[PDB]
Design a protein around this ligand. Structure first.
Ligand code: RLW
Ligand code: MG
Ligand code: ZN
Length: 330
């Protein structure tokens, strides 16, 4: 008939949480038959009316989403389609923050969400440094500079050239040039080597923050608009510790699996084992507390100031999760 399977019904009930921090993204991956990026991107595009606004044929959208999801590696524990789906949905919730209501154009919203979806595509489950130290083809292609992030962009864009995959076929050249620049600026900013400069600029922006009447953020130049979108997708990328603990612990298991596999590949080859990649010499709990204290909490504390007090529950969850990991240090 033209009615859904019962599995498709349970999935649609889970997707009702799509506007909430703490979406059961792992369950959505189970119910979608490992299609969390495709169903969550589709739901978000419908909810934000992006198909109508950008004249995206729904068949082209689904073909591109499935092609893009297929170029995430199912055998990589963290940097997979589920992480991509998570960052997309998290970016979606951050865009909906009251303090940013009516700030960003449809093109900017599209850029942030599209960027989120492609931001780790074809990730091999090892670091830029590993790819450089092994003389990998990727490191050679990109002159050791933001190797993975250049690759994710190039793959994300290249997949638009596959059969019925050009979701931007109806955008004008002007819209396409603008969207392209914003997507490149956002994904290059996911390289952790850029974290300190991004955070410095976000702090500068909190100190010189102007609001409109009704208390929404004023951003009147490209440089300020893009820096907020960059920090937003960066916050989405580093949002695992800010999620309900049952989600956070699953992300911790997965990043540690990926890191230990890198360490095993380094030990095998007699390379120096990278920080927190040695399964024989690792404090999972102390590593998470260090991650929160030095990287995640400073970023989210500065985000929370920018959009005060929209992010208070997210920051409270981060601080609760931090105390939980601290209390399990043996
Ligand atoms: C859920 O714990 C994490 C989640 C993500 C990340 C990262 N995101 N990508 C990146 O480039 C890094 C900074 C490695 C790092 C996480 O824990 C760190 C602390 C224990 C291992 C790494
Ligand atoms: Mg990345
Ligand atoms: Zn990522």
């Amino acid at each position: 008939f033209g009615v859904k399977t019962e599995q498709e019904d349970v999935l649609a009930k889970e997707l009702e949480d799509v506007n909430k921090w703490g979406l059961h993204v792992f369950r959505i991956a189970e119910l979608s038959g490992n299609r969390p990026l495709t169903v969550i991107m589709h739901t978000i595009f419908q909810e934000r009316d992006l198909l109508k606004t950008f004249k995206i044929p729904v068949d082209t959208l689904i073909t591109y989403l499935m092609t893009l999801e297929d170029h995430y590696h199912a055998d990589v524990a963290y940097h997979n389609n589920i992480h991509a789906a998570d960052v997309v949905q998290s970016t979606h919730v951050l865009l909906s923050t009251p303090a940013l209501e009516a700030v960003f154009t449809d093109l900017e919203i599209l850029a942030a969400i599209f960027a989120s979806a492609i931001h780790d595509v074809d990730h091999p489950g090892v670091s830029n440094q590993f790819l450089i130290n092994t003389n990998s083809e990727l490191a050679l292609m990109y002159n050791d500079s933001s190797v993975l992030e250049n690759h994710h962009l190039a793959v994300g864009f290249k997949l638009l050239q596959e059969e019925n995959c050009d979701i931007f076929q109806n955008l004008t050249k002007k819209q396409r040039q603008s969207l392209r620049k914003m997507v490149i600026d956002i994904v290059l900013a996911t390289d952790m080597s850029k974290h300190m400069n991004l955070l410095a600029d976000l702090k500068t922006m909190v100190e010189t923050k102007k609001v409109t009447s009704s208390g929404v953020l004023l951003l009147d130049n490209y440089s300020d608009r893009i820096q907020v979108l960059q920090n937003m997708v960066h916050c989405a990328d580093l949002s695992n510790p800010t999620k309900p603990l049952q989600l956070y612990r699953q992300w911790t298991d997965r990043i540690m699996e990926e890191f230990f596999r890198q360490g095993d590949r380094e030990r095998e080859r007699g390379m120096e084992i990278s920080p927190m990649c040695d399964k024989h010499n690792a404090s999972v709990e102390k590593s998470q507390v260090g991650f929160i204290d030095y990287i995640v909490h400073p970023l989210w504390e500065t985000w929370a100031d920018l959009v005060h007090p929209d992010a208070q529950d997210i920051l409270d969850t981060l601080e609760d999760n931090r105390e939980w990991y601290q209390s399990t240090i043996p």
